[PDB]
Structures are given as structure tokens and as C-alpha cells.
Design a protein around this ligand. Structure first.
Ligand code: N0S
Length: 152
């Protein structure tokens, strides 16, 4: 019914949850599982590097957002639209979107608000898919993501 949304949510939710808890989800992927698995391998390799390369800026933005509760987490959609959607789209910026999401997910675990991680992943997915579908489709979706970051 909306295959790109469903697959995006699975990849994003899995990465954020795994980043927060330190444990891999053992459940099978849904449809397009082969691609989703490679997308997840790519985020672990690339997204983890991004959180370190931008550590000071990431810690700074986190502090500025001052996330304490569910209402603070709900406020993030507006900021993501402002910063991510209102700019050039490329894979790098999409990785920063998702990687900073993981950064926030880990924060939510530290403040014992782990229940907000899946809603956060839904919000990120809404921003990504619902504001950049045209670009994502043209760039071959998650297959394109995997191809873009491929290690020979
Ligand atoms: C060179 C650039 C990366 C480094 C920039 C870091 C910035 O200082 C802040 C640290 C977090 C980033 C702001 N923001 C983080 C935002 C905006 C802040 C709220 C938020 C919340 C969640 Cl859950 C996820 C993302 C975000 C929106 O997503 C992006 C996407 C691309 C770039 C920036 C960005 C963004 O600017 N990406 S980029 O690759 O062009």
C-alpha cells in the first residue's frame, strides 16, 4: 500500500532501537528484507561514523533541544522539517537526519524515555518519506542508498 514508507520505517526504527539498546533485533525483516538488511549494515558502518565526526555539533544540538519528555519529542518534527526538508537533498543529509535520530534515541534511553524511540522513528520516517518521496524514488530508494555507499 505504501512500500517505501513501510521499508523506511523498518530500517530507521531498527537502527534507532539497536543504537539505543546495543542489541540487534533478531526478528526477520518484512518485505524487501534483503535490501533492508544491507541498508542497516550501511547505517551501522556510515551512521556510526557520522555521530563521531560530528560529535561536538551533535552534543550541542541535543543540549539545545533539551529533550526531557514526550512533548519535547513531539516538538522535533517541526525542527526536522525546518532543518532537513528545507535544504538540498542528498544521501549525506539523509544520513545526518537518521544518525542524529540515533543520537537522540540513545539520549532517550539515558533519561528512561525508551518508549519514545518508536514514535521518534515514525516522525523521522514521516519527514523523510513524506517530504522527499520524489527524490527518493528518482534515486532508487533503499537500493540506491545501498549502492551509493557500497564497499567494493
Ligand atoms: C555537514 C552537515 C552535517 C553536520 C551538521 C550538524 C548540525 O550542526 C546539527 C547537529 C545535528 C545537525 C542538525 N540537523 C538535525 C535535525 C534538526 C534538529 C532536530 C533533529 C531531530 C532528529 Cl530526531 C533528527 C534530525 C534532526 C535535522 O536533520 C539534519 C539533517 C541534515 C543536517 C542537519 C540536521 C545537515 O546539515 N547535514 S549535513 O551533512 O549537510
Amino acid at each position: 500500500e505504501d512500500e517505501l514508507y513501510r521499508q523506511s520505517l523498518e530500517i530507521i526504527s531498527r537502527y534507532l532501537r539497536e543504537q539505543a539498546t546495543g542489541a540487534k533485533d533478531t526478528k526477520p525483516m518484512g518485505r524487501s528484507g534483503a535490501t533492508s538488511r544491507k541498508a542497516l549494515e550501511t547505517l551501522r558502518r556510515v551512521g556510526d561514523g557520522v555521530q563521531r565526526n560530528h560529535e561536538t555539533a551533535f552534543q550541542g544540538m541535543l543540549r539545545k533541544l533539551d529533550i526531557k519528555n514526550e512533548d519535547d519529542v513531539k516538538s522535533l518534527s517541526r525542527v526536522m522539517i525546518h532543518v532537513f526538508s528545507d535544504g538540498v537533498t542528498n544521501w549525506g543529509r539523509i544520513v545526518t537526519l537518521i544518525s542524529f535520530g540515533a543520537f537522540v534515541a540513545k539520549h532517550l534511553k539515558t533519561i528512561n524515555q525508551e518508549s519514545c524511540i518508536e514514535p521518534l522513528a515514525e516522525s523521522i520516517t514521516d519527514v523523510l518519506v513524506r517530504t522527499k518521496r520524489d527524490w527518493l524514488v528518482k534515486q532508487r530508494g533503499w537500493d540506491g542508498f545501498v549502492e551509493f555507499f557500497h564497499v567494493e
